[PDB]
Amino acid sequence: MDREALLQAVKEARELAKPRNFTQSFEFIATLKEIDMRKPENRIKTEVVLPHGRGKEAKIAVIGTGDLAKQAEELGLTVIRKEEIEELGKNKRKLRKIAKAHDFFIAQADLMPLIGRYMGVILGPRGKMPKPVPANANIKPLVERLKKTVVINTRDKPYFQVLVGNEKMTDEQIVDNIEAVLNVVAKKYEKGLYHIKDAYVKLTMGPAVKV
Numbered sequence: 223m224d225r226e227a228l229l230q231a232v233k234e235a236r237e238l239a240k241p242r243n244f245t246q247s248f249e250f251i252a253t254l255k256e257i258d259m260r261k262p263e264n265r266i267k268t269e270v271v272l273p274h275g276r277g278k279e280a281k282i283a284v285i286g287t288g289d290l291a292k293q294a295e296e297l298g299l300t301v302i303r304k305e306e307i308e309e310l311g312k313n314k315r316k317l318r319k320i321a322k323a324h325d326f327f328i329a330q331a332d333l334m335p336l337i338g339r340y341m342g343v344i345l346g347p348r349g350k351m352p353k354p355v356p357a358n359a360n361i362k363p364l365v366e367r368l369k370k371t372v373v374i375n376t377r378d379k380p381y382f383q384v385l386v387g388n389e390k391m392t393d394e395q396i397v398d399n400i401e402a403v404l405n406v407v408a409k410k411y412e413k414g415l416y417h418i419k420d421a422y423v424k425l426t427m428g429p430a431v432k433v
């Protein structure tokens with residue numbers, strides 16, 4: 223599965239897709255062979271920074287006080303202050319809304335207990351448990367990475383699908399992004415990309431094109 227094959231798949235996925243009145247995203251899909259997904263160690267749940275980003279930036283919320291909140295404000299992010307944590311635990315409807323509206327959460331490390339007690343019941347099952355940072359952290363670099371980040375998640379099945387860009391990006395960009403995703407698999411298993419059984423590219427409402 224070389225770059226030429228990937229470009230061909232992206233190109234055809236783009237061409238086959240019917241026009242729709244929204245900007246469609248590119249999705250990359252892979253099945254795995256000869257990997258025992260019954261062993262938890264073989265499962266993948268890994269963030270990947272896409273070199274050209276997602277198409278539209280991921281939305282990030284920050285749970286923090288003091289200078290963490292200041293930084294979040296300076297970066298234009300949703301801020302959830304310490305007082306709001308208990309409130310959101312009460313108002314789970316609102317918490318669901320906030321969870322849906324964001325792709326990643328960053329949290330002041332010392333707030334993790336409070337977050338687990340009150341918000342984790344909603345965030346955890348959605349895979350949006352916050353990632354902790356030290357209270358003195360400069361979060362700008364992390365935020366910039368997360369804006370371009372997608373998650374590869376197989377759960378317990380030899381399959382994943384992941385966002386790799388949108389149609390306003392170039393084919394070359396989509397392929398770079400797909401390569402970044404594949405590198406996770408390459409690094410994960412002893413024989414790496416040997417374990418790719420079949421791979422596909424599609425636009426949101428277009429057909430899946432096999433690589």
Ligand SMILES: [Cl-]
Nearest residue numbers: 269270271272
């Ligand atoms: Cl990465």
Ligand SMILES: [Cl-]
Nearest residue numbers: 321322348350
């Ligand atoms: Cl969600």
Ligand SMILES: [Cl-]
Nearest residue numbers: 392393394395
């Ligand atoms: Cl291109």
